[PDB]
Amino acid sequence: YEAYPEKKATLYFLVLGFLALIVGSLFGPFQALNYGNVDAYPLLKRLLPFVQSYYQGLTLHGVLNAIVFTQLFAQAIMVYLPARELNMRPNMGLMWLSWWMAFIGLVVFALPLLANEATVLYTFYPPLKGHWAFYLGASVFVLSTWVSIYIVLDLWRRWKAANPGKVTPLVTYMAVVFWLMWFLASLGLVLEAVLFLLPWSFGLVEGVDPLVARTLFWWTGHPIAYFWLLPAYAIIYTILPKQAGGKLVSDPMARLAFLLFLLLSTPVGFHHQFADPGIDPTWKMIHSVLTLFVAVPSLMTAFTVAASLEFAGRLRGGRGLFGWIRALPWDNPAFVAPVLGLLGFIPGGAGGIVNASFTLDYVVHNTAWVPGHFHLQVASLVTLTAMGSLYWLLPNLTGKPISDAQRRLGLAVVWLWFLGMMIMAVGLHWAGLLNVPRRAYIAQVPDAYPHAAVPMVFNVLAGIVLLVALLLFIYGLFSVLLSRERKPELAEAPLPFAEVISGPEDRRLVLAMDRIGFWFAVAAILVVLAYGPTLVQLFGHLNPVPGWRLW
Amino acid sequence: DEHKAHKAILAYEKGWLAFSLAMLFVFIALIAYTLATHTAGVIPAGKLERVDPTTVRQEGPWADPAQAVVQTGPNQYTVYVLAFAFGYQPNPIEVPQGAEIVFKITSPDVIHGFHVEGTNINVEVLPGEVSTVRYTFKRPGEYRIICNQYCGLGHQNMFGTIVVKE
Amino acid sequence: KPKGALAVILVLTLTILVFWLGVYAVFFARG
Numbered sequence A: 001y002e003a004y005p006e007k008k009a010t011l012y013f014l015v016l017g018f019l020a021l022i023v024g025s026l027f028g029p030f031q032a033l034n035y036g037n038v039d040a041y042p043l044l045k046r047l048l049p050f051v052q053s054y055y056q057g058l059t060l061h062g063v064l065n066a067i068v069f070t071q072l073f074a075q076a077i078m079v080y081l082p083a084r085e086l087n088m089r090p091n092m093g094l095m096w097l098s099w100w101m102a103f104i105g106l107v108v109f110a111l112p113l114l115a116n117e118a119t120v121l122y123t124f125y126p127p128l129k130g131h132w133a134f135y136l137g138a139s140v141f142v143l144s145t146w147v148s149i150y151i152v153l154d155l156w157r158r159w160k161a162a163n164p165g166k167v168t169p170l171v172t173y174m175a176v177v178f179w180l181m182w183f184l185a186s187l188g189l190v191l192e193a194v195l196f197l198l199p200w201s202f203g204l205v206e207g208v209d210p211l212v213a214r215t216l217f218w219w220t221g222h223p224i225a226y227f228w229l230l231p232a233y234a235i236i237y238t239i240l241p242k243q244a245g246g247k248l249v250s251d252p253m254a255r256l257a258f259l260l261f262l263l264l265s266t267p268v269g270f271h272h273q274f275a276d277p278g279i280d281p282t283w284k285m286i287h288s289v290l291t292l293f294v295a296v297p298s299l300m301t302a303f304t305v306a307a308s309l310e311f312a313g314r315l316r317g318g319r320g321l322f323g324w325i326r327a328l329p330w331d332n333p334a335f336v337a338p339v340l341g342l343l344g345f346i347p348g349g350a351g352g353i354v355n356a357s358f359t360l361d362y363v364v365h366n367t368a369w370v371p372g373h374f375h376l377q378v379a380s381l382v383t384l385t386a387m388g389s390l391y392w393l394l395p396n397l398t399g400k401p402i403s404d405a406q407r408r409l410g411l412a413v414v415w416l417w418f419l420g421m422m423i424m425a426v427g428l429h430w431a432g433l434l435n436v437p438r439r440a441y442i443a444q445v446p447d448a449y450p451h452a453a454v455p456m457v458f459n460v461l462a463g464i465v466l467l468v469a470l471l472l473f474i475y476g477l478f479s480v481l482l483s484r485e486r487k488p489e490l491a492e493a494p495l496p497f498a499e500v501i502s503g504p505e506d507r508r509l510v511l512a513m514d515r516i517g518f519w520f521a522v523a524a525i526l527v528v529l530a531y532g533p534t535l536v537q538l539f540g541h542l543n544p545v546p547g548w549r550l551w
Numbered sequence B: 001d002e003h004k005a006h007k008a009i010l011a012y013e014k015g016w017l018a019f020s021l022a023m024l025f026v027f028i029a030l031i032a033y034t035l036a037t038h039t040a041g042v043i044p045a046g047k048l049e050r051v052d053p054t055t056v057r058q059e060g061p062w063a064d065p066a067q068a069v070v071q072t073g074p075n076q077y078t079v080y081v082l083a084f085a086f087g088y089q090p091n092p093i094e095v096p097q098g099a100e101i102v103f104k105i106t107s108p109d110v111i112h113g114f115h116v117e118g119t120n121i122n123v124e125v126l127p128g129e130v131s132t133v134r135y136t137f138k139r140p141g142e143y144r145i146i147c148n149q150y151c152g153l154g155h156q157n158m159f160g161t162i163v164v165k166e
Numbered sequence C: 001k002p003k004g005a006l007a008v009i010l011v012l013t014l015t016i017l018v019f020w021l022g023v024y025a026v027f028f029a030r031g
């Protein structure tokens, strides 16, 4: 800790992160039962008395699970890992600043959320008007990542100062293109908070234009998903191959995936605005095409990762078409959790690809399908990857060991989570296909969707299954976090970074990819090009409208 | 061995990358198609049409729901829908089958959904703006409108009806 | 040759294909 103070900072990012996840997830099974046509909210309201509505709980769930936990995780992973690869200390003053910004922002935002003063959901679309403490508290939380951005660019430049004419190391390159992307990405929401949300919630302006808010929101709105995703990819790419018993089959192909994410993660936001008025169809088509493009790096990722796993499995004795699968370390939860998350990502990305296809969005937009799509994505792949990291990262950060028993419980939590997520995914997609809306207390209109009787059952089962997983995870996290035993040979042991398989790389591409400034600029131009004209028009004809509180 | 596997993996990844690229392009081609057909009617007209949410019920085409249905063509009807908390006017919307229906929908309070069950009509409704979509009902009868965008505590019970006459 | 990888992407493609074709058909039914 004196030698590596970055350990303690990263530890705080993780723990606060999982805390958000646990409290956020408490509302999960209840919402699952709701989409199963079962009303267990009276029970929840006795247990947690401050919960006033299904929709206050939905806010807590999304904000806490999708915004808070994921970010804290991203900040933990994409700071520590580049730092451990480069064997250099981060700017510690900055690292504690960013933590405190996140904590304080969280606590301030939590105040009105718990008090039923900002029941607006995690999208907070105007004219639904939340408490100023929510918009401020959110802002300070999100901004904390600019401080993260600095820290990593700092580490980066320092290294390059000591290493001119050397290419950027794999994890650090990932983390740099990641953060730089997030900076552009984040400009949408920053603008929306600063020009509209904050002034409005404080009383400074009377109204906000709903269309311009939604547009600026979804600027940040999409890339924030890749912001959640990439920390899990960085682990899947540079660590998972080792845990699997193999190596990363390609370093350049990893960089390409990541580069493509810097270039294609922001200029696509209109795919959330397919059914919005006042946006030209030609821009909706452009974005759709560009969205289809951004799916390429994950398509690419699918193969590289799968190849790496095959390599691992063959190295461990697996023979045949399917034999390498069974040869993998299915006893190790650090390996199991991500692999399972990648499995569900198949249907997850598949549903995403449908969502992007402009007109096909009308079939599914705003139905239970969407929730089904994204739970495979963030609530499964990201969450499970973070879950499995406990079994290598927590010991690395605390010295505390993972007992054999604790590893077994780890497998169980992981598997049950995965399965519940699959089950729920089936129930929601199908329900969405039956026109069942998202964001709806549907168990309170029990005669409204009789056609959805079947998928409702999956939803219920999913609810109880995921209640069990979450329960086991709570017990299990605290068993390792509040464990008596501590062993510092574990804290000093290296991060299980994989090696890169022996292939003459194409040093040409790697070098081109390393011209980061160039690529950052390009990425910026593409955002100006995809968003510029449309925002120009919208600002030229603003039509602000009174806020409303309807809860 | 390791030298060999790298060549083979990369050889087939390039294959894969090309194939997925094609598949994506073919989709793009298939999406471009739908924009040329009548099914594209449901895509909102991208034009900005500002209105005043505070006075929309006192003055304008939304002020008399009984007169919100208006023949604008030989075979075309414009309908002025108000989506509000928590319902839709008119109730019901009545249109004839085979006629092209141009829905001009707006909100006096918060953002609502306008999703016509059984159909591709699925459009966000924003206060201050008129959302414009086009559909031709091919089967007579009673379609349901659902509000698929969270609008407050009346959300789950906010429903509308379109009746299509022969 | 990476037989396992190819299997995985085979599954991935079929999933995308069933998904995409599925929803396309549904779109036209509702058209």
Ligand code: HAS
Residues within 6 Å of the ligand: A123, A225, A226, A228, A229, A271, A272, A291, A292, A294, A295, A298, A299, A301, A302, A303, A305, A306, A309, A325, A339, A342, A343, A345, A346, A348, A349, A350, A351, A352, A353, A354, A355, A356, A357, A361, A364, A365, A366, A370, A373, A374, A377, A378, A382, C008, C012
């Ligand atoms: C982490 C977060 C998420 C990711 C990733 C993400 C990816 C996609 N999204 Fe999405 N998204 C949309 C389209 C996509 C597309 C094009 C992709 C793509 O990036 C997908 C690429 C993925 C693939 C093509 C899959 C590759 C598979 C891999 C990499 C695994 C292979 C398996 C292996 C290797 C296992 C092998 C193991 C063995 C041993 C066998 C659209 C619209 O076009 C909407 C709006 C819909 C509407 O109408 O409202 C949407 C909705 C959402 C929402 C809701 C928004 C809201 O709250 O209003 C969120 C939260 C979200 C999150 C996420 N989504 N998305």
Ligand code: HEM
Residues within 6 Å of the ligand: A025, A028, A029, A031, A032, A035, A058, A059, A061, A062, A065, A066, A069, A070, A121, A122, A123, A371, A375, A378, A379, A380, A383, A424, A437, A438, A439, A440, A441, A462, A463, A466, A467, A470
């Ligand atoms: C105990 C496991 C969990 C279950 C059973 C569960 C269940 C659900 C259900 C059924 C809904 C849809 C509710 C509605 O549309 O009204 C929902 C929405 C959502 N879930 Fe979860 N979920 C869980 C954990 C997670 C996690 C780990 C995350 C991501 C990190 C997450 C992210 C979200 C978000 C983003 C929303 C959308 C909220 C909104 O529309 O405002 N879920 N969850």
Ligand SMILES: CCCCCCCC/C=C\CCCCCCCC(=O)OC[C@H](O)CO
Residues within 6 Å of the ligand: A344, A347, A422, A425, A426, A429, A430, A433, C018, C019, C020, C021, C022, C023, C025, C026, C029
């Ligand atoms: C592994 C867990 C993942 C969960 C998997 C999600 C389930 C949805 C599956 C496939 C979508 C296919 C679309 C469904 C199309 C059914 C209707 C159909 O086939 O349409 C024909 C007709 O023209 C119109 O009614």
Ligand code: CUA
Residues within 6 Å of the ligand: B084, B085, B086, B087, B111, B112, B113, B147, B148, B149, B150, B151, B152, B154, B155, B156, B158
């Ligand atoms: Cu109006 Cu939900």
Ligand SMILES: [O-][O-]
Residues within 6 Å of the ligand: A221, A222, A225
């Ligand atoms: O948002 O994907």
Ligand SMILES: [Cu+2]
Residues within 6 Å of the ligand: A221, A222, A223, A225, A269, A271, A272
């Ligand atoms: Cu998106």
